[PDB]
Amino acid sequence: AEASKKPRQKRTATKQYNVTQAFGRRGPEQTQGNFGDQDLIRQGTDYKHWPQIAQFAPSASAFFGMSRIGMEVTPSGTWLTYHGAIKLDDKDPQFKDNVILLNKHIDAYKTFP
Amino acid sequence: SAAEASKKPRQKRTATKQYNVTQAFGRRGPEQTQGNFGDQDLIRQGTDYKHWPQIAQFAPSASAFFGMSRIGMEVTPSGTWLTYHGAIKLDDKDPQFKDNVILLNKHIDAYKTFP
């Protein structure tokens, strides 16, 4: 399933190519991703609740329009840095549940062991 | 009225000449709640900007935003937010490297020197 050929930030995680394979292990360091319980870990964009998650990932235009964009450069490297926040819709019916979905993958690896 | 572009959620909006970066995402500025990316032309043309495709290659897919990033949840008076932060390593060995950095530079904090 060729797909690592893509730049990290463009990869799509699936059954055939999981989160861990695409984006490395979940973990405490500032350079690692912290999101995803085991099911999402294994299934990526196949998980049965992906679309509910993905409704919050930004478009390309919003990624660069909403975020605080930075450049970090060290002797061996150059990184685009970014941070921001997405407000959830307090009126949406799904609100509670969206919070429960989100809160369960957020720091999940921490209750793997 | 205006467009039909603002009933989309912020994070899914896509600024064009017809509905520009200021309209979709608010003015650039110093604050942590605001974006800081874009020179006058990017802000005004958004996705019709000449070198959009060369900026946009650094935007993550939905899947990457969630597997690469450090995700959180903050609860203000505003509402509940999904927080996010990260670093996308640029490839030193793309011969477009040089050009990728200065292009990201043109736009980092560009609002500060706007005449």
Side-chain angles (χ1 to χ4, degrees), chain A residues 9-11 13 27 29 32 34 54 57-59 67-69 78 80 82 84 86 88, chain B residues 11-13 29 31 34 36 57 59-61 63 69-71 80 82 84 86 88 90:
Chain A
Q9 77 276 13
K10 302 266 131 198
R11 273 155 193 191
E29 271 89 332
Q32 306 180 94
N34 69 163
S59 49
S67 302
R68 317 269 312 162
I69 276 78
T78 298
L80 190 76
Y82 61 93
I86 310 299
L88 320 199
Chain B
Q11 77 282 180
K12 283 341 192 150
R13 248 109 97 160
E31 246 85 86
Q34 316 167 105
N36 68 331
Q57 85 192 300
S61 47
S63 177
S69 300
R70 296 204 60 89
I71 311 294
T80 310
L82 201 189
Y84 65 96
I88 287 124
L90 269 79

PDB file of all heavy atoms in Angstrom, chain A residues 9-11 13 27 29 32 34 54 57-59 67-69 78 80 82 84 86 88, chain B residues 11-13 29 31 34 36 57 59-61 63 69-71 80 82 84 86 88 90:
ATOM      1  N   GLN A   9       2.791  15.414   6.323  1.00  0.00           N
ATOM      2  CA  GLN A   9       1.654  16.237   6.598  1.00  0.00           C
ATOM      3  C   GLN A   9       0.539  16.002   5.594  1.00  0.00           C
ATOM      4  O   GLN A   9      -0.566  16.569   5.766  1.00  0.00           O
ATOM      5  CB  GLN A   9       2.057  17.718   6.701  1.00  0.00           C
ATOM      6  CG  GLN A   9       2.315  18.404   5.327  1.00  0.00           C
ATOM      7  CD  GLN A   9       3.706  18.222   4.743  1.00  0.00           C
ATOM      8  OE1 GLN A   9       4.529  17.372   5.184  1.00  0.00           O
ATOM      9  NE2 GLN A   9       4.003  19.080   3.744  1.00  0.00           N
ATOM     10  N   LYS A  10       0.808  15.186   4.562  1.00  0.00           N
ATOM     11  CA  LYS A  10      -0.211  14.829   3.514  1.00  0.00           C
ATOM     12  C   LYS A  10      -0.741  13.366   3.606  1.00  0.00           C
ATOM     13  O   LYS A  10      -1.686  12.985   2.863  1.00  0.00           O
ATOM     14  CB  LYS A  10       0.348  15.056   2.107  1.00  0.00           C
ATOM     15  CG  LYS A  10       0.837  16.517   1.813  1.00  0.00           C
ATOM     16  CD  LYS A  10      -0.313  17.321   1.147  1.00  0.00           C
ATOM     17  CE  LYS A  10      -0.537  18.676   1.827  1.00  0.00           C
ATOM     18  NZ  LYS A  10      -1.861  19.194   1.459  1.00  0.00           N
ATOM     19  N   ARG A  11      -0.091  12.542   4.454  1.00  0.00           N
ATOM     20  CA  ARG A  11      -0.372  11.094   4.525  1.00  0.00           C
ATOM     21  C   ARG A  11      -1.817  10.891   4.970  1.00  0.00           C
ATOM     22  O   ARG A  11      -2.366  11.780   5.628  1.00  0.00           O
ATOM     23  CB  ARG A  11       0.559  10.398   5.500  1.00  0.00           C
ATOM     24  CG  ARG A  11       1.774  10.007   4.857  1.00  0.00           C
ATOM     25  CD  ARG A  11       2.922   9.878   5.868  1.00  0.00           C
ATOM     26  NE  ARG A  11       4.227   9.789   5.185  1.00  0.00           N
ATOM     27  CZ  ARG A  11       5.361   9.463   5.801  1.00  0.00           C
ATOM     28  NH1 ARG A  11       5.310   9.241   7.098  1.00  0.00           N
ATOM     29  NH2 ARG A  11       6.534   9.378   5.138  1.00  0.00           N
ATOM     30  N   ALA A  13      -4.020   7.967   7.151  1.00  0.00           N
ATOM     31  CA  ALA A  13      -3.888   6.715   7.885  1.00  0.00           C
ATOM     32  C   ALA A  13      -5.090   5.771   7.582  1.00  0.00           C
ATOM     33  O   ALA A  13      -6.237   6.225   7.475  1.00  0.00           O
ATOM     34  CB  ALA A  13      -3.735   7.005   9.321  1.00  0.00           C
ATOM     35  N   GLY A  27       2.629   9.839  22.395  1.00  0.00           N
ATOM     36  CA  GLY A  27       3.621  10.008  23.420  1.00  0.00           C
ATOM     37  C   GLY A  27       3.693  11.415  23.904  1.00  0.00           C
ATOM     38  O   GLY A  27       3.172  12.302  23.252  1.00  0.00           O
ATOM     39  N   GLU A  29       6.251  13.718  24.418  1.00  0.00           N
ATOM     40  CA  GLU A  29       7.144  14.725  23.812  1.00  0.00           C
ATOM     41  C   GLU A  29       6.451  15.729  22.885  1.00  0.00           C
ATOM     42  O   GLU A  29       5.486  15.412  22.125  1.00  0.00           O
ATOM     43  CB  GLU A  29       8.202  14.037  22.937  1.00  0.00           C
ATOM     44  CG  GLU A  29       9.513  13.602  23.599  1.00  0.00           C
ATOM     45  CD  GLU A  29       9.427  12.196  24.177  1.00  0.00           C
ATOM     46  OE1 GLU A  29       8.314  11.740  24.563  1.00  0.00           O
ATOM     47  OE2 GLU A  29      10.459  11.529  24.243  1.00  0.00           O
ATOM     48  N   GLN A  32       5.759  14.617  19.162  1.00  0.00           N
ATOM     49  CA  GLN A  32       4.958  13.447  18.840  1.00  0.00           C
ATOM     50  C   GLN A  32       3.469  13.789  18.874  1.00  0.00           C
ATOM     51  O   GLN A  32       3.068  14.719  19.545  1.00  0.00           O
ATOM     52  CB  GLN A  32       5.214  12.369  19.895  1.00  0.00           C
ATOM     53  CG  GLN A  32       6.666  12.007  20.102  1.00  0.00           C
ATOM     54  CD  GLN A  32       6.786  10.941  21.152  1.00  0.00           C
ATOM     55  OE1 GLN A  32       6.837   9.749  20.816  1.00  0.00           O
ATOM     56  NE2 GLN A  32       6.775  11.346  22.440  1.00  0.00           N
ATOM     57  N   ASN A  34      -0.254  13.065  20.202  1.00  0.00           N
ATOM     58  CA  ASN A  34      -0.889  12.501  21.363  1.00  0.00           C
ATOM     59  C   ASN A  34      -2.293  11.979  21.154  1.00  0.00           C
ATOM     60  O   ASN A  34      -2.921  11.605  22.092  1.00  0.00           O
ATOM     61  CB  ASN A  34      -0.900  13.493  22.540  1.00  0.00           C
ATOM     62  CG  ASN A  34      -1.853  14.726  22.328  1.00  0.00           C
ATOM     63  OD1 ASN A  34      -2.199  15.426  23.298  1.00  0.00           O
ATOM     64  ND2 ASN A  34      -2.247  14.984  21.113  1.00  0.00           N
ATOM     65  N   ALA A  54     -12.981  14.168  11.995  1.00  0.00           N
ATOM     66  CA  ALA A  54     -12.533  15.010  10.862  1.00  0.00           C
ATOM     67  C   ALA A  54     -13.341  16.306  10.599  1.00  0.00           C
ATOM     68  O   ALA A  54     -12.807  17.285  10.078  1.00  0.00           O
ATOM     69  CB  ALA A  54     -12.364  14.184   9.579  1.00  0.00           C
ATOM     70  N   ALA A  57     -10.859  18.935  11.773  1.00  0.00           N
ATOM     71  CA  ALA A  57      -9.649  19.315  11.043  1.00  0.00           C
ATOM     72  C   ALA A  57      -9.895  20.453  10.055  1.00  0.00           C
ATOM     73  O   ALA A  57     -10.856  20.409   9.283  1.00  0.00           O
ATOM     74  CB  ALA A  57      -9.109  18.132  10.284  1.00  0.00           C
ATOM     75  N   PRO A  58      -9.017  21.449  10.052  1.00  0.00           N
ATOM     76  CA  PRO A  58      -9.106  22.620   9.117  1.00  0.00           C
ATOM     77  C   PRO A  58      -8.782  22.380   7.635  1.00  0.00           C
ATOM     78  O   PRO A  58      -7.920  21.571   7.294  1.00  0.00           O
ATOM     79  CB  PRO A  58      -8.053  23.606   9.652  1.00  0.00           C
ATOM     80  CG  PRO A  58      -7.032  22.677  10.472  1.00  0.00           C
ATOM     81  CD  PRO A  58      -7.908  21.542  11.020  1.00  0.00           C
ATOM     82  N   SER A  59      -9.431  23.155   6.764  1.00  0.00           N
ATOM     83  CA  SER A  59      -9.027  23.223   5.378  1.00  0.00           C
ATOM     84  C   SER A  59      -7.736  23.907   5.355  1.00  0.00           C
ATOM     85  O   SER A  59      -7.222  24.406   6.401  1.00  0.00           O
ATOM     86  CB  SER A  59     -10.002  24.085   4.568  1.00  0.00           C
ATOM     87  OG  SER A  59     -10.297  25.357   5.183  1.00  0.00           O
ATOM     88  N   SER A  67      -4.498  29.727  12.279  1.00  0.00           N
ATOM     89  CA  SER A  67      -3.312  29.362  13.070  1.00  0.00           C
ATOM     90  C   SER A  67      -2.271  30.463  13.270  1.00  0.00           C
ATOM     91  O   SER A  67      -2.260  31.456  12.518  1.00  0.00           O
ATOM     92  CB  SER A  67      -2.632  28.131  12.425  1.00  0.00           C
ATOM     93  OG  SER A  67      -3.588  27.114  12.377  1.00  0.00           O
ATOM     94  N   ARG A  68      -1.446  30.284  14.318  1.00  0.00           N
ATOM     95  CA  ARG A  68      -0.281  31.094  14.576  1.00  0.00           C
ATOM     96  C   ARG A  68       0.939  30.349  13.962  1.00  0.00           C
ATOM     97  O   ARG A  68       1.361  29.298  14.451  1.00  0.00           O
ATOM     98  CB  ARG A  68      -0.101  31.337  16.070  1.00  0.00           C
ATOM     99  CG  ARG A  68      -1.368  31.665  16.846  1.00  0.00           C
ATOM    100  CD  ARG A  68      -1.598  33.123  16.887  1.00  0.00           C
ATOM    101  NE  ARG A  68      -0.378  33.834  17.262  1.00  0.00           N
ATOM    102  CZ  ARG A  68      -0.218  35.118  17.048  1.00  0.00           C
ATOM    103  NH1 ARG A  68      -1.154  35.818  16.458  1.00  0.00           N
ATOM    104  NH2 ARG A  68       0.884  35.705  17.412  1.00  0.00           N
ATOM    105  N   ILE A  69       1.473  30.912  12.881  1.00  0.00           N
ATOM    106  CA  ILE A  69       2.472  30.232  12.030  1.00  0.00           C
ATOM    107  C   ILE A  69       3.851  30.658  12.382  1.00  0.00           C
ATOM    108  O   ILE A  69       4.116  31.797  12.675  1.00  0.00           O
ATOM    109  CB  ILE A  69       2.124  30.324  10.494  1.00  0.00           C
ATOM    110  CG1 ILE A  69       1.138  29.201  10.160  1.00  0.00           C
ATOM    111  CG2 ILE A  69       3.288  30.084   9.612  1.00  0.00           C
ATOM    112  CD1 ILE A  69      -0.295  29.475  10.584  1.00  0.00           C
ATOM    113  N   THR A  78      14.795  22.797   9.558  1.00  0.00           N
ATOM    114  CA  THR A  78      13.815  23.833   9.378  1.00  0.00           C
ATOM    115  C   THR A  78      12.384  23.293   9.417  1.00  0.00           C
ATOM    116  O   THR A  78      11.977  22.443   8.586  1.00  0.00           O
ATOM    117  CB  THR A  78      14.139  24.657   8.117  1.00  0.00           C
ATOM    118  OG1 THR A  78      15.413  25.270   8.330  1.00  0.00           O
ATOM    119  CG2 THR A  78      13.098  25.771   7.873  1.00  0.00           C
ATOM    120  N   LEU A  80       8.097  24.253   9.861  1.00  0.00           N
ATOM    121  CA  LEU A  80       6.916  25.114  10.016  1.00  0.00           C
ATOM    122  C   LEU A  80       6.187  24.858  11.324  1.00  0.00           C
ATOM    123  O   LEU A  80       5.633  23.810  11.522  1.00  0.00           O
ATOM    124  CB  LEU A  80       5.931  24.895   8.875  1.00  0.00           C
ATOM    125  CG  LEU A  80       4.772  25.905   8.805  1.00  0.00           C
ATOM    126  CD1 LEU A  80       5.340  27.169   8.236  1.00  0.00           C
ATOM    127  CD2 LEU A  80       3.643  25.446   7.897  1.00  0.00           C
ATOM    128  N   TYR A  82       3.135  25.613  14.225  1.00  0.00           N
ATOM    129  CA  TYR A  82       1.715  26.047  14.191  1.00  0.00           C
ATOM    130  C   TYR A  82       0.982  25.704  15.468  1.00  0.00           C
ATOM    131  O   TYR A  82       1.234  24.650  16.051  1.00  0.00           O
ATOM    132  CB  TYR A  82       0.977  25.388  13.047  1.00  0.00           C
ATOM    133  CG  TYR A  82       0.936  23.855  13.134  1.00  0.00           C
ATOM    134  CD1 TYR A  82      -0.129  23.219  13.741  1.00  0.00           C
ATOM    135  CD2 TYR A  82       1.923  23.062  12.521  1.00  0.00           C
ATOM    136  CE1 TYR A  82      -0.240  21.828  13.772  1.00  0.00           C
ATOM    137  CE2 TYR A  82       1.855  21.669  12.582  1.00  0.00           C
ATOM    138  CZ  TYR A  82       0.756  21.053  13.218  1.00  0.00           C
ATOM    139  OH  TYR A  82       0.624  19.679  13.278  1.00  0.00           O
ATOM    140  N   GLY A  84      -3.257  26.809  17.452  1.00  0.00           N
ATOM    141  CA  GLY A  84      -4.538  27.491  17.267  1.00  0.00           C
ATOM    142  C   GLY A  84      -5.608  26.760  18.032  1.00  0.00           C
ATOM    143  O   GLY A  84      -5.338  25.810  18.723  1.00  0.00           O
ATOM    144  N   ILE A  86     -10.007  25.695  17.604  1.00  0.00           N
ATOM    145  CA  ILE A  86     -11.276  25.550  16.856  1.00  0.00           C
ATOM    146  C   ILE A  86     -12.461  25.631  17.890  1.00  0.00           C
ATOM    147  O   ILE A  86     -12.476  24.872  18.852  1.00  0.00           O
ATOM    148  CB  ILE A  86     -11.366  24.071  16.296  1.00  0.00           C
ATOM    149  CG1 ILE A  86     -10.109  23.566  15.529  1.00  0.00           C
ATOM    150  CG2 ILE A  86     -12.659  23.813  15.560  1.00  0.00           C
ATOM    151  CD1 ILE A  86      -9.741  24.367  14.279  1.00  0.00           C
ATOM    152  N   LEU A  88     -15.972  24.708  19.303  1.00  0.00           N
ATOM    153  CA  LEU A  88     -17.028  23.764  18.914  1.00  0.00           C
ATOM    154  C   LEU A  88     -18.374  24.506  18.970  1.00  0.00           C
ATOM    155  O   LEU A  88     -18.507  25.531  19.623  1.00  0.00           O
ATOM    156  CB  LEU A  88     -17.000  22.479  19.756  1.00  0.00           C
ATOM    157  CG  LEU A  88     -15.665  21.792  20.158  1.00  0.00           C
ATOM    158  CD1 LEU A  88     -15.924  20.322  20.569  1.00  0.00           C
ATOM    159  CD2 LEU A  88     -14.529  21.853  19.136  1.00  0.00           C
TER     160      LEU A  88
ATOM    161  N   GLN B  11     -13.339  26.484  10.539  1.00  0.00           N
ATOM    162  CA  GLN B  11     -12.280  25.576  10.187  1.00  0.00           C
ATOM    163  C   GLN B  11     -12.375  24.925   8.808  1.00  0.00           C
ATOM    164  O   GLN B  11     -11.380  24.330   8.366  1.00  0.00           O
ATOM    165  CB  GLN B  11     -12.008  24.561  11.323  1.00  0.00           C
ATOM    166  CG  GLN B  11     -13.023  23.358  11.504  1.00  0.00           C
ATOM    167  CD  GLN B  11     -14.274  23.735  12.180  1.00  0.00           C
ATOM    168  OE1 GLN B  11     -15.179  22.923  12.403  1.00  0.00           O
ATOM    169  NE2 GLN B  11     -14.350  24.959  12.534  1.00  0.00           N
ATOM    170  N   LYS B  12     -13.519  25.039   8.118  1.00  0.00           N
ATOM    171  CA  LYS B  12     -13.724  24.439   6.838  1.00  0.00           C
ATOM    172  C   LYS B  12     -13.837  25.516   5.750  1.00  0.00           C
ATOM    173  O   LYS B  12     -14.079  25.235   4.548  1.00  0.00           O
ATOM    174  CB  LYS B  12     -15.017  23.588   6.839  1.00  0.00           C
ATOM    175  CG  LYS B  12     -14.990  22.159   7.535  1.00  0.00           C
ATOM    176  CD  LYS B  12     -13.580  21.549   7.750  1.00  0.00           C
ATOM    177  CE  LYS B  12     -13.794  20.052   8.152  1.00  0.00           C
ATOM    178  NZ  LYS B  12     -12.627  19.124   7.710  1.00  0.00           N
ATOM    179  N   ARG B  13     -13.725  26.772   6.181  1.00  0.00           N
ATOM    180  CA  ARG B  13     -14.017  27.895   5.275  1.00  0.00           C
ATOM    181  C   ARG B  13     -12.829  27.907   4.318  1.00  0.00           C
ATOM    182  O   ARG B  13     -11.825  27.302   4.628  1.00  0.00           O
ATOM    183  CB  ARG B  13     -14.156  29.192   6.070  1.00  0.00           C
ATOM    184  CG  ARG B  13     -15.482  29.775   6.122  1.00  0.00           C
ATOM    185  CD  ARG B  13     -16.278  29.736   7.437  1.00  0.00           C
ATOM    186  NE  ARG B  13     -16.127  30.966   8.152  1.00  0.00           N
ATOM    187  CZ  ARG B  13     -16.937  31.405   9.092  1.00  0.00           C
ATOM    188  NH1 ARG B  13     -18.007  30.742   9.436  1.00  0.00           N
ATOM    189  NH2 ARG B  13     -16.665  32.536   9.673  1.00  0.00           N
ATOM    190  N   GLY B  29      -3.216  39.680  13.494  1.00  0.00           N
ATOM    191  CA  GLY B  29      -2.833  40.456  14.627  1.00  0.00           C
ATOM    192  C   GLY B  29      -1.980  39.724  15.622  1.00  0.00           C
ATOM    193  O   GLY B  29      -1.759  38.491  15.484  1.00  0.00           O
ATOM    194  N   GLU B  31      -2.572  38.915  18.724  1.00  0.00           N
ATOM    195  CA  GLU B  31      -3.255  38.038  19.777  1.00  0.00           C
ATOM    196  C   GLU B  31      -3.267  36.491  19.544  1.00  0.00           C
ATOM    197  O   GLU B  31      -3.232  36.048  18.396  1.00  0.00           O
ATOM    198  CB  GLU B  31      -4.688  38.581  20.102  1.00  0.00           C
ATOM    199  CG  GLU B  31      -4.880  39.116  21.560  1.00  0.00           C
ATOM    200  CD  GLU B  31      -4.468  40.599  21.793  1.00  0.00           C
ATOM    201  OE1 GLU B  31      -5.332  41.464  21.537  1.00  0.00           O
ATOM    202  OE2 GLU B  31      -3.318  40.907  22.233  1.00  0.00           O
ATOM    203  N   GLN B  34      -5.831  35.135  17.235  1.00  0.00           N
ATOM    204  CA  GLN B  34      -5.910  35.519  15.833  1.00  0.00           C
ATOM    205  C   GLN B  34      -4.829  34.845  14.989  1.00  0.00           C
ATOM    206  O   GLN B  34      -3.762  34.525  15.496  1.00  0.00           O
ATOM    207  CB  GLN B  34      -5.824  37.091  15.651  1.00  0.00           C
ATOM    208  CG  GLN B  34      -6.619  37.983  16.577  1.00  0.00           C
ATOM    209  CD  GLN B  34      -6.207  39.429  16.493  1.00  0.00           C
ATOM    210  OE1 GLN B  34      -6.919  40.243  15.912  1.00  0.00           O
ATOM    211  NE2 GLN B  34      -5.050  39.773  17.074  1.00  0.00           N
ATOM    212  N   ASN B  36      -1.799  35.029  12.036  1.00  0.00           N
ATOM    213  CA  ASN B  36      -0.738  36.014  11.817  1.00  0.00           C
ATOM    214  C   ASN B  36      -0.128  35.904  10.463  1.00  0.00           C
ATOM    215  O   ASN B  36       0.823  36.555  10.172  1.00  0.00           O
ATOM    216  CB  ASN B  36       0.368  35.864  12.864  1.00  0.00           C
ATOM    217  CG  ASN B  36       1.130  34.571  12.713  1.00  0.00           C
ATOM    218  OD1 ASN B  36       0.582  33.575  12.252  1.00  0.00           O
ATOM    219  ND2 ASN B  36       2.375  34.573  13.148  1.00  0.00           N
ATOM    220  N   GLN B  57       0.790  23.154   0.178  1.00  0.00           N
ATOM    221  CA  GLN B  57       1.459  21.832   0.314  1.00  0.00           C
ATOM    222  C   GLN B  57       1.898  21.532   1.744  1.00  0.00           C
ATOM    223  O   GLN B  57       2.351  20.446   2.029  1.00  0.00           O
ATOM    224  CB  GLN B  57       2.670  21.725  -0.634  1.00  0.00           C
ATOM    225  CG  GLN B  57       3.978  22.293  -0.128  1.00  0.00           C
ATOM    226  CD  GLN B  57       5.052  22.396  -1.265  1.00  0.00           C
ATOM    227  OE1 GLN B  57       5.435  21.380  -1.886  1.00  0.00           O
ATOM    228  NE2 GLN B  57       5.539  23.631  -1.535  1.00  0.00           N
ATOM    229  N   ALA B  59      -0.050  22.348   4.433  1.00  0.00           N
ATOM    230  CA  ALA B  59      -1.244  22.023   5.198  1.00  0.00           C
ATOM    231  C   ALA B  59      -1.453  20.517   5.302  1.00  0.00           C
ATOM    232  O   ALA B  59      -1.356  19.821   4.326  1.00  0.00           O
ATOM    233  CB  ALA B  59      -2.492  22.667   4.587  1.00  0.00           C
ATOM    234  N   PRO B  60      -1.726  20.023   6.534  1.00  0.00           N
ATOM    235  CA  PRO B  60      -1.982  18.627   6.754  1.00  0.00           C
ATOM    236  C   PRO B  60      -3.396  18.280   6.321  1.00  0.00           C
ATOM    237  O   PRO B  60      -4.343  19.134   6.380  1.00  0.00           O
ATOM    238  CB  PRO B  60      -1.832  18.512   8.270  1.00  0.00           C
ATOM    239  CG  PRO B  60      -2.359  19.769   8.799  1.00  0.00           C
ATOM    240  CD  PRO B  60      -1.794  20.789   7.805  1.00  0.00           C
ATOM    241  N   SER B  61      -3.539  17.023   5.882  1.00  0.00           N
ATOM    242  CA  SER B  61      -4.809  16.349   5.701  1.00  0.00           C
ATOM    243  C   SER B  61      -5.421  16.243   7.043  1.00  0.00           C
ATOM    244  O   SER B  61      -4.703  16.307   8.060  1.00  0.00           O
ATOM    245  CB  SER B  61      -4.495  14.926   5.221  1.00  0.00           C
ATOM    246  OG  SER B  61      -3.478  14.359   6.014  1.00  0.00           O
ATOM    247  N   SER B  63      -6.361  13.603   8.531  1.00  0.00           N
ATOM    248  CA  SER B  63      -5.657  12.462   9.181  1.00  0.00           C
ATOM    249  C   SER B  63      -4.347  12.902   9.829  1.00  0.00           C
ATOM    250  O   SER B  63      -4.195  12.785  11.009  1.00  0.00           O
ATOM    251  CB  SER B  63      -5.488  11.339   8.158  1.00  0.00           C
ATOM    252  OG  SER B  63      -4.790  10.261   8.653  1.00  0.00           O
ATOM    253  N   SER B  69      -0.394  16.078  15.355  1.00  0.00           N
ATOM    254  CA  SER B  69      -0.473  17.244  16.231  1.00  0.00           C
ATOM    255  C   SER B  69      -0.629  16.911  17.705  1.00  0.00           C
ATOM    256  O   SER B  69      -1.019  15.796  18.088  1.00  0.00           O
ATOM    257  CB  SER B  69      -1.686  18.103  15.828  1.00  0.00           C
ATOM    258  OG  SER B  69      -1.576  18.551  14.484  1.00  0.00           O
ATOM    259  N   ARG B  70      -0.399  17.909  18.542  1.00  0.00           N
ATOM    260  CA  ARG B  70      -0.689  17.763  19.956  1.00  0.00           C
ATOM    261  C   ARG B  70      -2.004  18.388  20.346  1.00  0.00           C
ATOM    262  O   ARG B  70      -2.098  19.577  20.487  1.00  0.00           O
ATOM    263  CB  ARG B  70       0.466  18.294  20.778  1.00  0.00           C
ATOM    264  CG  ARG B  70       1.711  17.455  20.528  1.00  0.00           C
ATOM    265  CD  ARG B  70       2.673  17.534  21.677  1.00  0.00           C
ATOM    266  NE  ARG B  70       2.035  17.054  22.897  1.00  0.00           N
ATOM    267  CZ  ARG B  70       2.044  15.782  23.276  1.00  0.00           C
ATOM    268  NH1 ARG B  70       2.657  14.859  22.543  1.00  0.00           N
ATOM    269  NH2 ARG B  70       1.426  15.455  24.397  1.00  0.00           N
ATOM    270  N   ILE B  71      -3.015  17.553  20.550  1.00  0.00           N
ATOM    271  CA  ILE B  71      -4.423  17.961  20.633  1.00  0.00           C
ATOM    272  C   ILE B  71      -4.855  18.134  22.054  1.00  0.00           C
ATOM    273  O   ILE B  71      -4.499  17.346  22.875  1.00  0.00           O
ATOM    274  CB  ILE B  71      -5.287  16.838  20.108  1.00  0.00           C
ATOM    275  CG1 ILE B  71      -4.759  16.343  18.780  1.00  0.00           C
ATOM    276  CG2 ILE B  71      -6.794  17.245  20.086  1.00  0.00           C
ATOM    277  CD1 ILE B  71      -4.826  17.330  17.590  1.00  0.00           C
ATOM    278  N   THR B  80     -16.312  25.844  24.430  1.00  0.00           N
ATOM    279  CA  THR B  80     -15.317  24.808  24.383  1.00  0.00           C
ATOM    280  C   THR B  80     -14.613  24.897  23.067  1.00  0.00           C
ATOM    281  O   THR B  80     -15.250  24.824  22.019  1.00  0.00           O
ATOM    282  CB  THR B  80     -15.923  23.414  24.325  1.00  0.00           C
ATOM    283  OG1 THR B  80     -16.897  23.287  25.354  1.00  0.00           O
ATOM    284  CG2 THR B  80     -14.837  22.371  24.490  1.00  0.00           C
ATOM    285  N   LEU B  82     -11.248  23.013  20.704  1.00  0.00           N
ATOM    286  CA  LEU B  82     -10.298  21.988  20.456  1.00  0.00           C
ATOM    287  C   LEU B  82      -8.925  22.665  20.146  1.00  0.00           C
ATOM    288  O   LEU B  82      -8.788  23.381  19.132  1.00  0.00           O
ATOM    289  CB  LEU B  82     -10.804  21.136  19.308  1.00  0.00           C
ATOM    290  CG  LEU B  82     -10.196  19.749  19.242  1.00  0.00           C
ATOM    291  CD1 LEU B  82     -10.550  19.009  17.994  1.00  0.00           C
ATOM    292  CD2 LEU B  82      -8.831  19.977  19.170  1.00  0.00           C
ATOM    293  N   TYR B  84      -4.683  22.927  19.365  1.00  0.00           N
ATOM    294  CA  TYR B  84      -3.795  22.132  18.440  1.00  0.00           C
ATOM    295  C   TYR B  84      -2.461  22.780  18.234  1.00  0.00           C
ATOM    296  O   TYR B  84      -2.395  23.957  18.130  1.00  0.00           O
ATOM    297  CB  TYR B  84      -4.451  21.818  17.061  1.00  0.00           C
ATOM    298  CG  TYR B  84      -4.744  23.038  16.197  1.00  0.00           C
ATOM    299  CD1 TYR B  84      -3.852  23.423  15.218  1.00  0.00           C
ATOM    300  CD2 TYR B  84      -5.945  23.750  16.302  1.00  0.00           C
ATOM    301  CE1 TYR B  84      -4.080  24.498  14.389  1.00  0.00           C
ATOM    302  CE2 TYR B  84      -6.186  24.806  15.494  1.00  0.00           C
ATOM    303  CZ  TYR B  84      -5.235  25.191  14.519  1.00  0.00           C
ATOM    304  OH  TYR B  84      -5.414  26.249  13.647  1.00  0.00           O
ATOM    305  N   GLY B  86       1.849  22.004  16.683  1.00  0.00           N
ATOM    306  CA  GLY B  86       2.680  21.131  15.914  1.00  0.00           C
ATOM    307  C   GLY B  86       3.821  21.828  15.205  1.00  0.00           C
ATOM    308  O   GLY B  86       3.975  23.019  15.336  1.00  0.00           O
ATOM    309  N   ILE B  88       5.868  21.062  11.260  1.00  0.00           N
ATOM    310  CA  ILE B  88       5.976  20.268  10.093  1.00  0.00           C
ATOM    311  C   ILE B  88       7.375  20.537   9.604  1.00  0.00           C
ATOM    312  O   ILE B  88       7.753  21.699   9.303  1.00  0.00           O
ATOM    313  CB  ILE B  88       4.986  20.719   9.069  1.00  0.00           C
ATOM    314  CG1 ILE B  88       3.561  20.300   9.476  1.00  0.00           C
ATOM    315  CG2 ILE B  88       5.407  20.145   7.723  1.00  0.00           C
ATOM    316  CD1 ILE B  88       2.644  21.479   9.548  1.00  0.00           C
ATOM    317  N   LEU B  90      10.346  20.707   7.179  1.00  0.00           N
ATOM    318  CA  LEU B  90      10.489  20.970   5.769  1.00  0.00           C
ATOM    319  C   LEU B  90      11.660  20.181   5.193  1.00  0.00           C
ATOM    320  O   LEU B  90      12.728  20.090   5.811  1.00  0.00           O
ATOM    321  CB  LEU B  90      10.651  22.481   5.551  1.00  0.00           C
ATOM    322  CG  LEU B  90       9.396  23.359   5.312  1.00  0.00           C
ATOM    323  CD1 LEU B  90       8.655  23.703   6.521  1.00  0.00           C
ATOM    324  CD2 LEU B  90       9.832  24.668   4.668  1.00  0.00           C
TER     325      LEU B  90
END
